[PDB]
Amino acid sequence: KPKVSLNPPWNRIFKGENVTLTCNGNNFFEVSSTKWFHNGSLSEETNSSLNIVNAKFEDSGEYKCQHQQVNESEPVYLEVFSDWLLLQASAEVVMEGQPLFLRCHGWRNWDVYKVIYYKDGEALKYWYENHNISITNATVEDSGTYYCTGKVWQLDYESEPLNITVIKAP
Amino acid sequence: TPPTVKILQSSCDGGGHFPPTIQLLCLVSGYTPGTINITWLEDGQVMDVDLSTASTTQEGELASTQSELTLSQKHWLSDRTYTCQVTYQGHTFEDSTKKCADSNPRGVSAYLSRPSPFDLFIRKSPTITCLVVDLAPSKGTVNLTWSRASGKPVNHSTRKEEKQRNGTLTVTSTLPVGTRDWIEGETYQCRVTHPHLPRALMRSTTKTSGPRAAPEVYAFATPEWPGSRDKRTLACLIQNFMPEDISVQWLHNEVQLPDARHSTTQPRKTKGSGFFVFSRLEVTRAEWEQKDEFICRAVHEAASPSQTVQRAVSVN
Amino acid sequence: TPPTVKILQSSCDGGGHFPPTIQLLCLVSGYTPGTINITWLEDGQVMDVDLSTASTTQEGELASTQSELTLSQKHWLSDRTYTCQVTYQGHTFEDSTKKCADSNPRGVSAYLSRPSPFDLFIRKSPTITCLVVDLAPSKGTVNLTWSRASGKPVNHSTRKEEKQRNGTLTVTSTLPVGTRDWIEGETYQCRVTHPHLPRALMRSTTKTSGPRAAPEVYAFATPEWPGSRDKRTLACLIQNFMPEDISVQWLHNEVQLPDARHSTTQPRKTKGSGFFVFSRLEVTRAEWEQKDEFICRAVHEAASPSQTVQRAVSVN
Numbered sequence A: 001k002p003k004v005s006l007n008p009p010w011n012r013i014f015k016g017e018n019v020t021l022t023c024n025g026n027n028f029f030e031v032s033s034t035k036w037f038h039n040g041s042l043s044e045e046t047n048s049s050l051n052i053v054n055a056k057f058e059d060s061g062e063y064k065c066q067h068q069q070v071n072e073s074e075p076v077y078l079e080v081f082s083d084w085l086l087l088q089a090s091a092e093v094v095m096e097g098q099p100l101f102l103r104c105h106g107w108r109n110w111d112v113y114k115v116i117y118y119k120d121g122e123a124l125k126y127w128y129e130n131h132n133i134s135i136t137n138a139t140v141e142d143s144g145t146y147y148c149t150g151k152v153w154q155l156d157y158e159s160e161p162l163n164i165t166v167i168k169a170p
Numbered sequence B, C: 001t002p003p004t005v006k007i008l009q010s011s012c013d014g015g016g017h018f019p020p021t022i023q024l025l026c027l028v029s030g031y032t033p034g035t036i037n038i039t040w041l042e043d044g045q046v047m048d049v050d051l052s053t054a055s056t057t058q059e060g061e062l063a064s065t066q067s068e069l070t071l072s073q074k075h076w077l078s079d080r081t082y083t084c085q086v087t088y089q090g091h092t093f094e095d096s097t098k099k100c101a102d103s104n105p106r107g108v109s110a111y112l113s114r115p116s117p118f119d120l121f122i123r124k125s126p127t128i129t130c131l132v133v134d135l136a137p138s139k140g141t142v143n144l145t146w147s148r149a150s151g152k153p154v155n156h157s158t159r160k161e162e163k164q165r166n167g168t169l170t171v172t173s174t175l176p177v178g179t180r181d182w183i184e185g186e187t188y189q190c191r192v193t194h195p196h197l198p199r200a201l202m203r204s205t206t207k208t209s210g211p212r213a214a215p216e217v218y219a220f221a222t223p224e225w226p227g228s229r230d231k232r233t234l235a236c237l238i239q240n241f242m243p244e245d246i247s248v249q250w251l252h253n254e255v256q257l258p259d260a261r262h263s264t265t266q267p268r269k270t271k272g273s274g275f276f277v278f279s280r281l282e283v284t285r286a287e288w289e290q291k292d293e294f295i296c297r298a299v300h301e302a303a304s305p306s307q308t309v310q311r312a313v314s315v316n
């Protein structure tokens, strides 16, 4: 089956950011022989790399790619936001041992100070600058409603909450 | 020739710190010689301190002098703006200073004001102010849209922009408000949108809901002080009222006094009751020599039946 | 006589953004007139740019002169220590300034409170407080120390390291200051150093300079309100005192009332000379009958000679 990989791997972007979805596959032969299923309709992009330059609100939704007679890929959920702070993650569903990532992205990559990551109402971590948290191994207790609060231009704000679930991989 | 006005700061200890006594030295030079009044400002407030106004030194056909302000570390590190203003020949030249960060604006803020009860009930033309502060001058000039909660149209709102002393802009939008529409409970909304921003600033105002209590007014005079004897300070306690929207006036000879005379504080929550405000006015000897009563008047929504309760006092 | 030398820098406005030509003026005054060698040092290294414009000015038996260094904009943020080196009679004197480091290094803010007139004039056990709160929790401890201006030894402080709900760290240090030394104006300094703080935090407090003025306490009761049997509140206007530091208490039958009973407003500046405080206390019916000379006391540093001004409140 084909798979969709994002560059950058954040499935939540801003209104006006850039992300390229790549239809990564095995024994793909010619790269210009695939089609891009949007939410519902067909996109007209080619070369197995659909870029969303200056992304609007309508670019969010279901994304999948199809290569010849094998069916479409498992659809990734893009969600274009527009806020002062956005909590970006590598994946909402993360297996055991998979590397979990969280980043408190400011609006139009503004520098954010005093960023506090909260996991279900308690302070997971705090730093004076904009910082990521990169969990090398993921645990089932390392899940919940993650959200970050920071300071953009010396004013306190609040990111949209993110439901991250880590499940037991067989 | 117009004067040239600069400000020199104090030392900075060499290593990394601020000295505990910070000297702000306003140099004025290259003016036509005469009388110059130095006024020092702290965010638009004139203070009365022992500023060291040096003598005027004449250099050729020009002249120069200086003034000095002293500060502690706390007031300088409180991130305030201090302005040396020369009141020379009926003209004002301004130069300001401030503790300077590297690059960090304070970010656009929006504040919505409920109408004063004096505007609501006495003048019967209430207005609502959306104040946009800490606006950088990097274009924008924020779009200011007015609406209600029920979608009804609003009156035409006037707008103004003032270039403040501390580098920023302050954009005021004043909207006249229907009185019957306001007292019935219509929620007004001010939307401040900037192009270089995410989701815009929405501010919502309404008539404050809850229990209502009539404001209890008491007024007191001064029982004399040794020395002084030329001025008296009257107080007015208005207490036990809900909600907190109260206008305090200080009438005399059935004539409204200017608001610069009184010093009415903000409402604060009492112990198991409503709010209290305190008013203080200074009369000269020429005002209470006519024996007429200084009448402290509270305008409030629950001050039945005239939306006004007043207490008149005079000095002895 | 040794010369008294000071160093001034050009103030930064528009607030935030530095001026392009930062000028340093090292004013040397109060010396016996003669020959003085003036040079400038960049961490002990001599440049090629200086101004030798300012001549001597013989004010009586002493004299005064200065020198100006003009800089480019980017040289000031290079964090290079500058020193105006003055040689006179074979003697070497130096003052240094660099770019003023931030009051909050990378976000870590420290507030050093001054002792109130309470604990300064009643129990004579005043506690200065260094509250530094923005710190991230790490394995390294918060190296907090205390100093004075005259180098006298300080007492043992109490540290209160605690992690807050929002992941920050609260460091509170309370030190018992000497009353006599605080009346001297001995500048107490709190110095905070952390493993992940690039430069030291220095906060300094002194006895508040300026004029001195005794408080002018007046304390009134209120007329009896219809429908009110238990409230019977009392007001106290305390006015015209220098400086802002004042503590207000209430005394029932020579016993101090709790501070939660009275609502003391902040000292706001009056028009004429000083500040006014509007403390209000409500008394229930049982102690309304047991009135026994209600007292509004306002302890203040300039209330000569008893450092305390109190009046009497009577219902009748």
Ligand SMILES: *[C@@H]1O[C@H](CO)[C@@H](O[C@@H]2O[C@H](CO)[C@@H](O[C@@H]3O[C@H](CO)[C@@H](O[C@@H]4O[C@H](CO)[C@@H](O)[C@H](O)[C@H]4NC(C)=O)[C@H](O)[C@@H]3O)[C@H](O)[C@H]2NC(C)=O)[C@H](O)[C@H]1NC(C)=O
Pocket: A038, A039, A040, A056, A057, A058, A059, A060, A061, A062, A079, A080, A081, A082, A083, B199, B200
């Ligand atoms: C495939 O499905 C996806 C969803 O599964 C479709 O995406 C949807 O597209 C519409 C049209 O762009 C979006 O409508 C916007 O709705 C948001 C509210 O959700 C509005 O933004 C809001 O703006 C205010 C302004 O002050 C701001 O305060 C809010 O914070 C902001 N909302 C957010 C969440 O930040 C905006 O004005 C539009 O009305 C849908 O939201 C969007 N769905 C999702 C889940 O995002 C997609 O269109 C569809 N594919 C096709 C081809 O139709």
Ligand SMILES: *[C@@H]1O[C@H](CO)[C@@H](O[C@@H]2O[C@H](CO)[C@@H](O[C@@H]3O[C@H](CO)[C@@H](O)[C@H](O)[C@@H]3O)[C@H](O)[C@H]2NC(C)=O)[C@H](O)[C@H]1NC(C)=O
Pocket: B043, B079, B106, B109, B111, B113, B131, B133, B134, B164, B165, B166, B168, B170
């Ligand atoms: C630069 O200077 C301007 C004024 O010269 C500052 O604007 C002031 O901002 C404060 C809040 O930051 C405003 O206070 C607010 O007042 C409303 C009622 O008007 C009240 O409801 C709020 O709770 C708050 O107290 C203040 O009104 C405003 N002044 C003016 C004249 O508009 C600005 O903050 C300064 N910026 C910096 C970085 O110093």
Ligand SMILES: *[C@@H]1O[C@H](CO)[C@@H](O[C@@H]2O[C@H](CO)[C@@H](O[C@@H]3O[C@H](CO)[C@@H](O)[C@H](O)[C@@H]3O)[C@H](O)[C@H]2NC(C)=O)[C@H](O)[C@H]1NC(C)=O
Pocket: A114, C111, C113, C131, C133, C134, C164, C165, C166, C168, C170
């Ligand atoms: C995380 O939460 C804590 C609450 O415990 C915040 O600490 C509080 O910070 C404010 C200022 O940011 C302090 O207010 C200060 O009080 C002193 C008292 O004299 C006053 O002089 C200052 O002008 C200022 O108003 C407050 O005291 C402090 N709370 C405690 C308990 O120490 C902290 O700021 C929060 N951090 C973030 C990043 O949100």
Ligand SMILES: *[C@@H]1O[C@H](CO)[C@@H](O[C@@H]2O[C@H](CO)[C@@H](O)[C@H](O)[C@H]2NC(C)=O)[C@H](O)[C@H]1NC(C)=O
Pocket: A008, A103, A130, A131, A132
């Ligand atoms: C948070 O993670 C992002 C993405 O992993 C980091 O952004 C990358 O930073 C490296 C090094 O500076 C660059 O080479 C990449 O081009 C960046 N990628 C993107 C998409 O921006 C970011 O630096 C991390 N932040 C922190 C504080 O570690």
Ligand SMILES: *[C@@H]1O[C@H](CO)[C@@H](O)[C@H](O)[C@H]1NC(C)=O
Pocket: A016, A017, A018, A053, A054
């Ligand atoms: C997205 O790519 C375009 C194309 O170069 C660029 O102009 C734009 O600035 C990019 N936007 C972001 C947010 O990187």
Ligand SMILES: *[C@@H]1O[C@H](CO)[C@@H](O)[C@H](O)[C@H]1NC(C)=O
Pocket: A070, A071
């Ligand atoms: C998708 O491909 C699988 C091959 O594993 C096939 O079994 C399935 O029927 C396909 N789904 C379709 C054709 O809808």
Ligand SMILES: *[C@@H]1O[C@H](CO)[C@@H](O)[C@H](O)[C@H]1NC(C)=O
Pocket: A097, A098, A099, A136, A137
């Ligand atoms: C989780 O830890 C194991 C340790 O053996 C490591 O091999 C694995 O790569 C880690 N998972 C990551 C980095 O996603």
Ligand SMILES: *[C@@H]1O[C@H](CO)[C@@H](O)[C@H](O)[C@H]1NC(C)=O
Pocket: A145, A161, A162, A163
């Ligand atoms: C996260 O999951 C919980 C569990 O039902 C749900 O109540 C909550 O609304 C979810 N939050 C988001 C942001 O999806």
Ligand SMILES: *[C@@H]1O[C@H](CO)[C@@H](O)[C@H](O)[C@H]1NC(C)=O
Pocket: C143, C193
């Ligand atoms: C840390 O505190 C100790 C205790 O007095 C002191 O001797 C030492 O110099 C301090 N170190 C730093 C780097 O502040």
